[PDB]
Design a protein around this nucleic acid. Sequence first.
RNA 1: GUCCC
RNA 2: GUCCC
Lengths: 776, 774
Amino acid sequence: ARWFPKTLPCDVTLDVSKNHVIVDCTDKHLTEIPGGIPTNTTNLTLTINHIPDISPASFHRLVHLVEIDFRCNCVPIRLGSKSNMCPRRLQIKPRSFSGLTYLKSLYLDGNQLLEIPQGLPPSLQLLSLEANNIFSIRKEQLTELANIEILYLGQNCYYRNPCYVSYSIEKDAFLNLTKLKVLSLKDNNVTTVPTVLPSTLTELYLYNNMIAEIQEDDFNNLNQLQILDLSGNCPRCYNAPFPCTPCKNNSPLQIPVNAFDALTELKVLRLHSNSLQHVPPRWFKNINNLQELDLSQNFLAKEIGDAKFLHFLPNLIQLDLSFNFELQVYRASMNLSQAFSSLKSLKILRIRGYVFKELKSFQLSPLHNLQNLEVLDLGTNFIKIANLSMFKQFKRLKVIDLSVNKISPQVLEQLYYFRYDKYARSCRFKSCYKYGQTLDLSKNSIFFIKSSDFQHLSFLKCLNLSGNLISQTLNGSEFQPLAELRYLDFSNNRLDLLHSTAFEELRKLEVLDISSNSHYFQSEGITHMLNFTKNLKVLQKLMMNDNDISSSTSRTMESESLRTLEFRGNHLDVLWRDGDNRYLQLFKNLLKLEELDISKNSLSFLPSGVFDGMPPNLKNLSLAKNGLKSFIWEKLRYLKNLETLDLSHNQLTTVPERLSNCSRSLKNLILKNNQIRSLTKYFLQDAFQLRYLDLSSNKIQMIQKTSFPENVLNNLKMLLLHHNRFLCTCDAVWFVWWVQHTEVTIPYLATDVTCVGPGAHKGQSVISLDLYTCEL
Amino acid sequence: ARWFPKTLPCDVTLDVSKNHVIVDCTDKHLTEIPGGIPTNTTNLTLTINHIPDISPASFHRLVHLVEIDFRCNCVPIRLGSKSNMCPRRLQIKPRSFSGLTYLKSLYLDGNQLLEIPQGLPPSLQLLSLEANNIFSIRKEQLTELANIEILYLGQNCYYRNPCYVSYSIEKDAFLNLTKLKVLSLKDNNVTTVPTVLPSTLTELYLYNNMIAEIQEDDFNNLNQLQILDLSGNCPRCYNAPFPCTPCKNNSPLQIPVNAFDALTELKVLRLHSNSLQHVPPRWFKNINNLQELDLSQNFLAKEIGDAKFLHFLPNLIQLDLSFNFELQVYRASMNLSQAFSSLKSLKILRIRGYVFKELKSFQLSPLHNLQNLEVLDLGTNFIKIANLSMFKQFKRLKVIDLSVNKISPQVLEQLYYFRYDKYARSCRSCYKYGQTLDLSKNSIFFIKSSDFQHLSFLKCLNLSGNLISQTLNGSEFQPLAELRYLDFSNNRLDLLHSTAFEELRKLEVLDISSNSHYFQSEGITHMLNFTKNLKVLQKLMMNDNDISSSTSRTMESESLRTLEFRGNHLDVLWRDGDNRYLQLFKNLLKLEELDISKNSLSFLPSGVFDGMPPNLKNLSLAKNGLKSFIWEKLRYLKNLETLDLSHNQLTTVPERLSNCSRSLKNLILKNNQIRSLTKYFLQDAFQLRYLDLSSNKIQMIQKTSFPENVLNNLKMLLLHHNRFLCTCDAVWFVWWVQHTEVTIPYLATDVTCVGPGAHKGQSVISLDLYTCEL
RNA sequence: GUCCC
RNA sequence: GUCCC
Ligand SMILES: *[C@@H]1O[C@H](CO)[C@@H](O[C@@H]2O[C@H](CO)[C@@H](O)[C@H](O)[C@H]2NC(C)=O)[C@H](O)[C@H]1NC(C)=O
Ligand SMILES: *[C@@H]1O[C@H](CO)[C@@H](O[C@@H]2O[C@H](CO)[C@@H](O)[C@H](O)[C@H]2NC(C)=O)[C@H](O)[C@H]1NC(C)=O
Ligand SMILES: Nc1nc(=O)c2ncn([C@@H]3O[C@H](CO)[C@H]4OP(=O)(O)O[C@H]43)c2[nH]1
Ligand SMILES: Nc1nc(=O)c2ncn([C@@H]3O[C@H](CO)[C@H]4OP(=O)(O)O[C@H]43)c2[nH]1
Ligand SMILES: *[C@@H]1O[C@H](CO)[C@@H](O)[C@H](O)[C@H]1NC(C)=O
Ligand SMILES: *[C@@H]1O[C@H](CO)[C@@H](O)[C@H](O)[C@H]1NC(C)=O
Ligand SMILES: *[C@@H]1O[C@H](CO)[C@@H](O)[C@H](O)[C@H]1NC(C)=O
Ligand SMILES: *[C@@H]1O[C@H](CO)[C@@H](O)[C@H](O)[C@H]1NC(C)=O
Ligand SMILES: *[C@@H]1O[C@H](CO)[C@@H](O)[C@H](O)[C@H]1NC(C)=O
Ligand SMILES: *[C@@H]1O[C@H](CO)[C@@H](O)[C@H](O)[C@H]1NC(C)=O
Ligand SMILES: *[C@@H]1O[C@H](CO)[C@@H](O)[C@H](O)[C@H]1NC(C)=O
Ligand SMILES: *[C@@H]1O[C@H](CO)[C@@H](O)[C@H](O)[C@H]1NC(C)=O
Ligand SMILES: *[C@@H]1O[C@H](CO)[C@@H](O)[C@H](O)[C@H]1NC(C)=O
Ligand SMILES: *[C@@H]1O[C@H](CO)[C@@H](O)[C@H](O)[C@H]1NC(C)=O
Ligand SMILES: *[C@@H]1O[C@H](CO)[C@@H](O)[C@H](O)[C@H]1NC(C)=O
Ligand SMILES: *[C@@H]1O[C@H](CO)[C@@H](O)[C@H](O)[C@H]1NC(C)=O
Ligand SMILES: *[C@@H]1O[C@H](CO)[C@@H](O)[C@H](O)[C@H]1NC(C)=O
């Protein structure tokens, strides 16, 4: 098809509408800028490479560039690879950028630069120098940036990238940048708010610094500011997972009552880890529009019970008072001030880490009349006692989150309140809530449940009981009131499936997760009824992964409704022991089942009967990670609606003589990570239904035309070949040609479609291989 | 050293004292008997190979053979590999064995044989034909076995190896085998006890068959029999994990009351899975010496509460009544008959699977006066309630086993009572600390001191696999003043308090592995410094705890010798830039063994080694995805003897190992990405004794890297599964490997050339390189 | 590759 | 390969 092979080791995309030519060279182990980058190129990314220098030749031809992303070509020693340390900082020669008349955005983060690069064109709206070694800002070095709007200078002096001094900012350094909207000086060892900043600021990031005091006029002129983050100045250091130095005498960040008076526009204020003991209402006298307030990781436990400042926050959407507990105090209860009632607009309230023994209904009354409240997060509070029925007054809420507590009778990262910098950029780039009302009781100490535990909660759509201690012979009496429940996450418990009536009271249940309930499945002689499915009339999806199931009293699972079954990490090798026919029809009576996952079941072979016993509408089958050493391909004939076969991470050595003759229906075939050395002569002949084919990470040496007829290849959405053992002799002439000239999408042509030999061409990409010597 | 390279792909061992020459060819992907087997060869093993035939040429020279082990060269379809199925049964030509005048033992199990091989010498004392296809025994075929003593015929007709008919045994087939001691007809589809058997039998195995009835005189003459197993004839099939066909009418195996009268010598009687409802005392009227009785997997729940037969068993060492519960009955308590008191000799009692709600002290009184009782096993009973204090009356017992129950306020295989055949042949723990109370796999959520009142004598407590979610503060085990071993694994330790466990003042070993729960949620306080309070602790296991944070910065002990810290997140604690935890193990002054494998340590920040306590001998950094390693830093570890760096991504070795560590004896670098050795790698590294470089990508090895004055001290040197290039540059290496004394495993199997083309796939032991010397 | 798996 | 890990 193609007349001129694409040899450039970068992805190239046309966005014809927005007039853009996008060249992505992210992570291509480059040591030079590749030649032949299109002249029409507008967005060029060279992130994560080892190009040691930039020069006028770097971009000479590329006069249409609006964005260069040149991050992490020399990342500071402690942030970067220890196996591929950068030897010497990126060198930028003069005039490298002054040519680029249309350049709007320049990223040079993570290059060990000592100074703000000079000679930048006046077109530049965005400059980014995170994780460099620039810790002294001077007015003179900034004059070139007159039209700059966004400026990132953070992560240039902190514990992962130390500069061993205080950050220096000359007086009025930023004042003449009259268009500057966004200024980020986070994670920098700054000692004072730099002044005077231009009144044109919308966003100021000053977090994770050594600022002890805000002067009353530090933000005098900033009438346009929308976001201010002063977090992690005088930090709360208890249980900090980074080196943390508090302000002396447990001082807080000192903020004058009138510091915020100019900030009429402020929408987000962030005062996380500022060791605050008081929130003066006077702060918010002229901020009527504040929406998001973060007061997590302070010492505001007392204040939570007073909190006059809330009376001045009627438009607040989001409030975070997480982790304000006094060290070595375990409060009997939660004292929320009446003031919380004045938060007419509040959608999201979070108070993790108040740390209290017992939660009672009336303690939450300050919230009864917040009409817009969607999320209430009382996680990580070590609550021992809580009558769940209290939440009957909270039908309107989308999520009630009591995760990580000690109870017995819109998602946040695993590390969140204790990350150093949760917004920090990586070198790459730049859940049942949807079912309805969700009660998250995950990670508590619930050993035993009964119906009255759930009295008055019939409105729930999702209950999360993951990671409790539930060890009970559920018999269908325990969840009686949960008439609306669509989703139950019962993972990481100790289900005892003695009774086939387990869960049958949850009459509207669409999804059940009983994964990682392996305990009782590990002791011989225990009765388990896997036939419990029959009683669940609307169940769509069952997850029973990592249950180590090696026995069952019942011989068949039954459902008229079940569409998907995850059965990963069990012992079907033991149930289907060769010679024992009793369980070969375990899934057969799941008549509507379309998706089945029996990966990680130690199936080194499949006894005959397995495929005949599969239910008739099976579409999507995974046998991945089974250590399969053999596979009778013909047996795929029984699976008449099979569309996806995942056989990844096994030990298969062969493909079928003709895939067409094994399955007419099969569209996606995944054989990545096997031991295939060669393909059958007529492998894909007449396999007209085939659309996707992964042969990556095998040991294939040759591919001949017969195996891969073009009337199949040209239907394929994707064909993966990378990481094989290709031999680039004159016998590979067809394959090499076809790869060079095909339209078919083949990932990693630049990176890992490589010759292993013969010696001469070893390690050389096949896309670049010249084989003319074979045609004399 | 060696003048004639060993080219035979079999291990060869001299036992000079017993006059034996042992050749082991087990599992060497052979398709022929190798030539050059020594003539003096006495024991020859060819197990697990693909040799398709035996012939007079097979052993022609080997006239001094006493044992041929030729198992599993053609295993039946369903027992064998499905990826390397055997195409056609083993063919044994006539005269193959008649040469072998001294042959005592012959194993031909697992070869798909259709008939008992003929032509066997009269010297033969043991013949073994398990897992063949021989399901009709004829007197005529056995005449050749006149001097036979041990004869295995089992596993020739059962569900893994079906023959599709009943087993046939001609009348008196075994009678004229006048020396036969041991006969095994297990797992065979036998319908009746074959008669008449020779009176010379000591052991008869008839289990897992289709025997419905014992005739009163089936065992008439067997006055010498010691072991009888009739198990799995009319099996109890509830929750059986194999195809199980009960006798119709829920009938038991029918045993007439006088069936055993001749068996004065019987020591072991095994009646497991015989669907027995009664044990008539009359059975044991003439057996006073019975020692071991298995009555597991019957329906003897009622009988347990009567059990007059025990009055006739004063010499019984071992009794098993496990799994006798009536289906869908959950008894309130255990009714043991008074009769149990008469078992003066009983060392071991097992009653799993009685299935009852509550155990009370007095229910065990029938046992109070059994002086010799060592083991009491009440596992898998779904016991809801048990006052542990009752065991105060049982100080004398070595093990009290309450494992797999439902309690809250030798070792047996994982599958045991429900295996088909627990004795079946393959083709190839805190008990020792003293009194042990095994409470593993219960539902204990909360513990307090009174739970252990009166149990001060305990040496081992196993709480593994409970629900313990408690901020242990050192008050909970107060009474356990003697406890040497605590297994607290698979719980949910909340290490808030650094006084946890401190009351266990005699504790030598603590396992708190797989207590990861509270370690997975940010902002929770954990005191890893709890070790300080544990004055005699030798060994601490805290594996698979996913530990990524700690309030305290150092662990302290004067006593601790071994710390297992596998499966945690030291990569997070030691984040580059954060110096605070680099001395976590430094103050464990007597620590000799440390395991920090599986901690995702892709690199070691500088200071890790300086922070290691001074007497560290044995260090594992396996399975960390290490891509780089500053070998010089090994200088800090002055008493280092073992470094395990297996399963990582290392690409190089140090320029001189001698200049990194003088002390290092064992260096394990298996499963890395090493492509070459440094020029003078091992020069002067005289202390080195073990070196694993297996599963790397090494191409060449030169004499400079591997000087002979080091190599020849090595106990073991592993090289297998590398990328060796067998050009004329490899002349030295190839020569040295061929001629060295040094032990190198897998020379026959996986020390292979990958090239050049010509020599590809060829073993280096067999490589001829004369073309290099013209 | 006789039991485990 | 800046937050993670
Ligand atoms: C942040 O700046 C402080 C001081 O402003 C730096 O600390 C000084 O650094 C040197 C080397 O550690 C010491 O000898 C001085 O004693 C320090 N002075 C003070 C007052 O602490 C600190 O290193 C900087 N932090 C980072 C991570 O670069
Ligand atoms: C044990 O022997 C029985 C006969 O007692 C075998 O069962 C016969 O085999 C075929 C095929 O299964 C049936 O059509 C016959 O009717 C069976 N006969 C009877 C009397 O049932 C059985 O297959 C043998 N067992 C094994 C494991 O090989
Ligand atoms: N799984 C299970 N959990 C229990 O808590 C229980 N109590 C009695 N039983 C009985 O134990 C036998 C083996 O588990 C089961 O068979 P059953 O007699 O129907 O009744 C069962 C229990 N089984
Ligand atoms: N680990 C833990 N388990 C608890 O049960 C508990 N109750 C209160 N707390 C307090 O929560 C804080 C963070 O875990 C701990 O710090 P503390 O204030 O010393 O007291 C602790 C508990 N901590
Ligand atoms: C291309 O660059 C412009 C300006 O830097 C930017 O707004 C646009 O999103 C970029 N797109 C891509 C895909 O790089
Ligand atoms: C709650 O806290 C406030 C402010 O600290 C305190 O004054 C008040 O007495 C407390 N009220 C209750 C109900 O505990
Ligand atoms: C929980 O509170 C409800 C009121 O919603 C009440 O009916 C129920 O009895 C309470 N349960 C307990 C143990 O207090
Ligand atoms: C339940 O909570 C657990 C642990 O907090 C989390 O992994 C899981 O995603 C939650 N389940 C659902 C369905 O959202
Ligand atoms: C379940 O247990 C309840 C009470 O806990 C008992 O009353 C009943 O037998 C069981 N119900 C069903 C539907 O099996
Ligand atoms: C499940 O199987 C058992 C037999 O093992 C049967 O008694 C029970 O009622 C079955 N349950 C259903 C829902 O079919
Ligand atoms: C098939 O199922 C897997 C999970 O088992 C899923 O990730 C994949 O997207 C599915 N594909 C199709 C085409 O149904
Ligand atoms: C496979 O191929 C043969 C010959 O073309 C044909 O007879 C047979 O029906 C085919 N089976 C399928 C399922 O295509
Ligand atoms: C060698 O064969 C004899 C006879 O079968 C036996 O007693 C001895 O234990 C065997 N030794 C080995 C090492 O096979
Ligand atoms: C357990 O038994 C002991 C005596 O062995 C008694 O002192 C204690 O009170 C008992 N505990 C209970 C709850 O019965
Ligand atoms: C404790 O019991 C567990 C769980 O059954 C068992 O695996 C372990 O070996 C026992 N502990 C010790 C130290 O013997
Ligand atoms: C531990 O807690 C118990 C109560 O459960 C308390 O009585 C005891 O004094 C505490 N011990 C220590 C060492 O703090
Ligand atoms: C452990 O360290 C903590 C402070 O981090 C301290 O409270 C406690 O005294 C220490 N405990 C021991 C036993 O050293």
